[PDB]
């Protein structure tokens, strides 16, 4: 239990953690946490895990994360029991995250016109539900029904734009006149994941109800839109690009 | 105005329609409405999109155009199209008159009201992913677009700075068939096949039918101060579904979207 958490945590991010409730603050992620983005800097403000250790496997767990930011840039026997434990505990957990700001700044691309790319979301909630989308603690084999809830989803992409205490404020102030492309939107998504692996049923089903999406484009963004398409293809498919890098 | 608009119509039509004849338009002298039935589209019809695609077959079942000649300056044109089917395949390797026609067309399309019904666009690809042919599809029960005011009320409007359009989609569905059975350029007026599409498990739908409304505001100023494009979308529950077969082909598909988008820049001269 505690050892698993500690080891995993150790690498992404110890004596004090005792796995009794838990509480953490001001965790700075590693530069090698993972996408080709090199994490220039990464920071998680506050984190909380509430484990019902005595009553585990009867009722769902809880983890609440407050203030996580991410900054990035382009770059040149016992184990089987443990695994089943991790499976059952992760299958019915509830995650609640607020104030998340992933901002990715590219300077090398579109040379001479550096841009900053950004995703803003100040509340996300994913929980396990039953076949009929009423939330519950169901343990099932055939399919997993997750329900996520998404408040203030916003994306900004602004062309021609550029210490720990200052940086945190900068990352958190945005959540209003930046060149947003996706106005803040709130909605709910019903994901259903198949575990049978059968070829008669889909791997993923999603029913997302969103309200009032507004998307805005400007002349700079419209000009760089094709360049941007190239960018996203690159994130998603970088290994295919790898052969073309020079080997003289 | 009747003769000029008629000739312009024959230019525009002539660009996209296979074997066009000016005799194809049927006019109603009683009101000045014009209708066309059973159009055939040319292979190069979708070129304006600059995609490496080839239109094996296209069909416009019924097309009707209502023009208010008498009140045309003060009232909008209307166009209804029914049964549009597109089967595309990937492609392997006087001064006053000109000015007046441009301004006239500008007024017409600025307040045009379009309603299209029973749309099926099908992309059959056997060349890429060889041995694993697939078919992509977009179906639309109805698509409509009208020009409106600042407050989204349909009205004839002429504004120098801004253009407001309200488009409604009813029953839009996208299907991605893996290892699909292709109609092909089999020349079997295909027509029946799209007939079945008007109307389930014969297609693998990544997008189950959804209806929605788009409020678009365009800025013709070109001013940096205001966004060139604005859009507000209100939709119904959106149901997306991923096959296990489609998920294995997903990365290849991302490749395809990019290759299509960027094809213009890799032109080969000869």
UniProtKB/Swiss-Prot annotation, chain B:
Disulfide bonds: none annotated. Residues 1-93 form the Chorein N-terminal domain. Transmembrane segments: none annotated. It is found in: Membrane. Signal peptide: none annotated. Belongs to the VPS13 family. Mediates the transfer of lipids between membranes at organelle contact sites. Binds phospholipids, including phosphatidylcholine (PC), phosphatidylethanolamine (PE), phosphatidic acid (PA), and phosphatidylserine (PS). May play a role in mitochondrial lipid homeostasis, Golgi vesicle transport, reticulophagy, actin cytoskeleton organization and formation of the prospore membrane. This is Intermembrane lipid transfer protein VPS13. It comes from Chaetomium thermophilum (strain DSM 1495 / CBS 144.50 / IMI 039719) (Thermochaetoides thermophila).
